Design a protein around this ligand. Structure first.
Ligand SMILES: Nc1ncnc2c1ncn2[C@@H]1O[C@H](COP(=O)(O)OP(=O)(O)OP(=O)(O)O)[C@@H](O)[C@H]1O
Ligand SMILES: Nc1ncnc2c1ncn2[C@@H]1O[C@H](COP(=O)(O)OP(=O)(O)OP(=O)(O)O)[C@@H](O)[C@H]1O
Ligand SMILES: Nc1ncnc2c1ncn2[C@@H]1O[C@H](COP(=O)(O)OP(=O)(O)OP(=O)(O)O)[C@@H](O)[C@H]1O
Ligand SMILES: [Mg+2]
Ligand SMILES: [Mg+2]
Ligand SMILES: [Mg+2]
Lengths: 236, 236, 236
């Protein structure tokens, strides 16, 4: 045989396999969820290396009575966590700090080398005592490998996620997602290199705000085909 | 031959040929024009690869009664074009969407490989049904080659432009402008590579707002030497 | 041996030498000081190439009666310095332009090649008559080499600084800080290249505002271990 079914099947496979192509994007969606259930999503994409870099001021829930707060006000609040008695706050800012972070990765990702680094409030490597002397990238713990959680990608065989609960303190984020080259070919070798470098960092980012998770599911996840997992382990 | 004239000629040539030098910038000016005639300009530069990346929230006319609107408010408006009934708008946002985009390129550009990609409202490859599975960079159509329009560069032999009319829907932009290496030398080959990589992405961007095109012509184009074309095909 | 002292010594050396490691960050802190003594600090870090890029609108003191000014308002003020009579200002904006810029560099820096380029108000190479034709990066004068000033790093042997007085005109900034490879090994050569490229531009930036220098010293410099020099040549 039936060629209407053969045509459906070819159509399916073309969609399912497309992300494996040269110059096809890997996709990263980071979702921050806050205590009253609001969500902020950050989308990054690239074919070669996704660099998902988020400042601590960017990860705060930044809406106050319908208006967006400035980086100045947000950083002022963050400062008191970084340096003792460096602002004038008499109470904490936990209302605006994420309770949970979800990382959704979809595409031809090198799962051995994808790294998620949760860094300090001013961008330093996280530790008890943050200091410029002991500041580095890609610590051993940031490589999640088989600690990624598999999720349905509806034929693509290519979505996983990672989840983390925060502890009431602002953080910043550095995610590095390299392309799978386990087919034995180094795309950085030879004259192709220039074409790869030209393609790095060329896709616009997008930040979205949602008052609750169901809005996120209805108008992001299911609009574009990223499967997401809720607190009841039900997929959307 | 007369050495006052010889000196003038050397002076002319030094200015005209300067952009061909190693570490000389290529120049990109993107101009958005809106329905009441206001203009927003975005300037990018690099010697090796210009990466002109603009979010859809950045391309909206964002001035409201003398004050700049927040990304939150702008994205809220954009959302309704991306996902059906995802905001509370009862009317469209066409007042703030560009009618026209102009791309001005000046310098030692590889015109075979310069690419202009008009992408969807959340940064995905543009198509009838946008979806994460079918998201890529540098589609075949983005390479304009002889569809660039030549304009005077006053001796430089090195300015072209590209124009597009939008259709009432928000878009995002990815422009990739590589350097002309048709003199036979690969600047990415050998020990020079590190010096090239150090130079990528090192020039500050600049965004400017104008209430009308003549302001743009008087205080940008003719101030710095980018020739621009108006709706009467007259140059400025 | 006395092994309590041997343990102290090993602990010291581990902290002092850490920045020499592969994937350890170089650190850059730029401090702008304004006429009433307020300070803005900008922090950048990377192990391979720090790219410290600051727009002129970002370098303005942008607080007005407790609220942060928009890029639109700030750029409007800057415009009049770039293009004659392009805004409606009847007085200058010198209250909000830095009097002084300090550049603090800490780590395994190639001091032969670190470059600090003070560029024009719209990002062009600085000169009497700024023009797109004569726009380039890494001019010979931007390499400071032995014009860097040595400062204590408390055992690291690895901090220097550079200072400049401005002249009442807005500027933009491009700082390029490459890693020291004088141990004879090219980290861009061979299969390591891909791992280097993956690490570029992956550390979150941080901007902070202080009403006076002592706040900067107490809650940034001495919090994280960057030594700073005041107008009395006393270190903090
Ligand atoms: N509700 C759930 N909670 C947690 N994990 C789930 C859930 N549903 C499915 N998964 C996991 O997702 C993975 C992929 O599932 P499945 O093969 O059914 O999806 P699919 O639509 O074929 O997608 P793919 O092409 O990605 O395989 C499996 O490991 C499965 O256990
Ligand atoms: N008013 C116009 N509308 C459209 N195209 C124009 C207009 N004026 C000039 N051009 C085109 O610009 C190109 C360059 O023109 P011309 O040689 O006169 O400029 P020039 O000052 O010598 O600059 P260059 O050094 O870039 O050649 C030509 O293809 C010309 O047709
Ligand atoms: N108050 C000051 N003003 C200007 N320069 C200073 C001042 N104090 C120290 N320096 C300079 O800093 C440099 C390093 O000093 P010193 O060796 O005492 O510091 P250290 O704590 O051992 O740090 P390092 O490990 O970086 O050497 C010297 O060149 C010194 O002259
Ligand atoms: Mg399956
Ligand atoms: Mg000509
Ligand atoms: Mg010493």
């Amino acid at each position: 045989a039936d060629l209407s079914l053969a045509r459906q099947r070819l159509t399916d496979e073309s969609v399912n396999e497309a992300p494996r192509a040269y110059d096809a994007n890997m996709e990263l969606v980071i979702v921050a969820e806050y205590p009253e259930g609001q969500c902020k999503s950050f989308h990054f994409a690239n074919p070669f290396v996704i660099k998902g870099v988020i400042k601590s001021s960017e990860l705060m829930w930044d809406i106050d009575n319908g208006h967006q707060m400035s980086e100045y006000e947000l950083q002022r609040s963050i400062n008191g966590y970084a340096a003792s008695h460096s602002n004038m706050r008499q109470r904490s800012a936990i209302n605006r700090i994420p309770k949970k972070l979800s990382f959704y990765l979809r595409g031809n990702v090198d799962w051995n080398k994808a790294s998620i680094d949760i860094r300090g409030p001013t961008g330093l490597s996280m530790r008890q005592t943050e200091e410029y002397s002991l500041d580095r990238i890609r610590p051993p713990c940031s490589y999640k490998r088989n600690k990624f959680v598999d999720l349905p990608s509806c034929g693509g065989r290519c979505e996983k996620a990672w989840y983390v609960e925060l502890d009431g303190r602002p953080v910043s984020i550095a995610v590095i997602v390299p392309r799978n080259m386990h087919n034995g070919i180094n795309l950085y070798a030879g004259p192709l290199l220039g074409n790869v470098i030209e393609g790095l960092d060329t896709v616009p980012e997008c930040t979205q705000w949602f008052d609750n998770a169901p809005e996120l599911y209805a108008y992001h996840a299911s609009n574009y085909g990223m499967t997401m997992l809720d607190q009841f382990s039900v997929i959307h």
